[PDB]
């Protein structure tokens, strides 16, 4: 596969600026943002797979993490 | 008018439409509804030739998105080596930082692209 | 946290040579190897989150991916 | 006998134990159940002082695991900057390759460990 890998599927491009769930790219692999990242429109959504790597939280922020709820 | 057309063309990967719209004097640094830019959309969607053409026509290499990503940032992110090289040849600020203070090289390390990182490191 | 993150938990080390599920590490995060990776005993188990990044396969190979059913 | 205790001490961060075993002639390069050495295990588990001691007592700095990871490979995989630097100062083969042709630098970039990558350039 000369393109991007999403699991096994060879896809033309990952979901970085559009599509759901948003993805970050690593080693030509399309990989999912943490579910707590707010999908962005004028930017990428995450920089990795974890709740402290979002650009903005879907719900609450409990620095440095995005969380469904506060404790 | 010509702005929205150039934006859709860069997005969809339509080399000919882009060259034409440039010819008919479309704004090379037009902004879409999210403040994005043809150069940026072209890098996002992996369109080397279109990136090259936009650059030949004075596209701003230091246009920033919502968090201060330049097209070089996004190239590093996705791991588009060839596009990154083309942006470096055309005046891309390699020290430029997004709102979290990261440069394209930082982003490259997060993407795990050794060759792009290497090119960026030696700068 | 100045050690490693496993999700939000701050931990002394990741599971690179022992423990289940086995882990790779990226920018100080402990992240899981793909479940089709065979847990290794003389080395790390994987290099990233995906099934083409295992050292060896828990079940069937299908280059370059470790899979459950061929 | 002593070798098993040394290997365990290296896993568990027991520096006082490592010291007393070395003092009683424990094999600094003893191989475990899986062919791994104290230095590798101390690296795996982030025990800096222990890699310091093991090195001063002649641990094999380029010993190799199942896939040809040297301790430096492992330090780069995990993100142990300091241990990696210590390894370098004591003769880590900066060009060594695993059975996939990857060097420590390769692996540092693979695992997003910028500072590591940066001292291996």
Swiss-Prot record, chain C:
Autophosphorylated. Autophosphorylation occurs in trans, i.e. one subunit of the dimeric receptor phosphorylates tyrosine residues on the other subunit. Ligand-binding increases phosphorylation on tyrosine residues. Dephosphorylated by PTPN12. This is Receptor tyrosine-protein kinase erbB-2. It comes from Homo sapiens (Human). Expressed in a variety of tumor tissues including primary breast tumors and tumors from small bowel, esophagus, kidney and mouth. It is linked to Glioma: Gliomas are benign or malignant central nervous system neoplasms derived from glial cells. They comprise astrocytomas and glioblastoma multiforme that are derived from astrocytes, oligodendrogliomas derived from oligodendrocytes and ependymomas derived from ependymocytes. It is found in: Cell membrane; Cell projection, Ruffle membrane. Disulfide bonds join 1-10, 14-30, 33-46, 37-54, 57-66. Belongs to the protein kinase superfamily. Tyr protein kinase family. EGF receptor subfamily. The chain holds residues 531 to 600 of 1255 of the full protein. Glycans are attached at residue 41. Homodimer. Heterodimer with EGFR, ERBB3 and ERBB4. Part of a complex with EGFR and either PIK3C2A or PIK3C2B. Interacts with PLXNB1. Interacts with MUC1; the interaction is enhanced by heregulin (HRG). Interacts with KPNB1, RANBP2, EEA1, CRM1 and CLTC. Interacts with PTK6. Interacts with RPA194 and ACTB. Interacts with PRKCABP, SRC and MYOC. Protein tyrosine kinase that is part of several cell surface receptor complexes, but that apparently needs a coreceptor for ligand binding. Essential component of a neuregulin-receptor complex, although neuregulins do not interact with it alone. GP30 is a potential ligand for this receptor. Regulates outgrowth and stabilization of peripheral microtubules (MTs). Upon ERBB2 activation, the MEMO1-RHOA-DIAPH1 signaling pathway elicits the phosphorylation and thus the inhibition of GSK3B at cell membrane. In the nucleus is involved in transcriptional regulation. Associates with the 5'-TCAAATTC-3' sequence in the PTGS2/COX-2 promoter and activates its transcription. Implicated in transcriptional activation of CDKN1A; the function involves STAT3 and SRC. Involved in the transcription of rRNA genes by RNA Pol I and enhances protein synthesis and cell growth.
């Amino acid at each position: 596969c000369s393109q991007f890998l999403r699991g096994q599927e060879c896809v033309e491009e990952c979901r970085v600026l559009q599509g759901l769930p948003r993805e970050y790219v690593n080693a030509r692999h399309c990989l999912p943002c943490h579910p707590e990242c707010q999908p962005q429109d004028g930017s990428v959504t995450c920089f990795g797979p974890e709740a402290d790597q979002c650009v903005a939280c879907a719900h609450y922020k409990d620095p440095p993490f995005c969380v469904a709820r506060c404790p | 008018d010509l702005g929205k057309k150039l934006l859709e063309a860069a997005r969809a990967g339509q080399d000919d439409e882009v060259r034409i719209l440039m010819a008919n004097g479309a704004d090379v640094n037009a902004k879409d509804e999210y403040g994005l830019t043809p150069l940026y959309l072209a890098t996002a969607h992996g369109h080397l030739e279109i990136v090259e053409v936009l650059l030949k026509n004075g596209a701003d290499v230091n246009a920033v998105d919502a968090i201060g990503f330049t097209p070089l940032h996004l190239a590093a992110f996705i791991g588009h080596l060839e596009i990154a090289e083309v942006l470096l040849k055309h005046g891309a600020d390699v020290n430029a930082q997004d709102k979290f203070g990261k440069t394209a090289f930082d982003i490259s390390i997060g993407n795990g692209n050794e060759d792009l990182a290497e090119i960026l490191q030696k700068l």
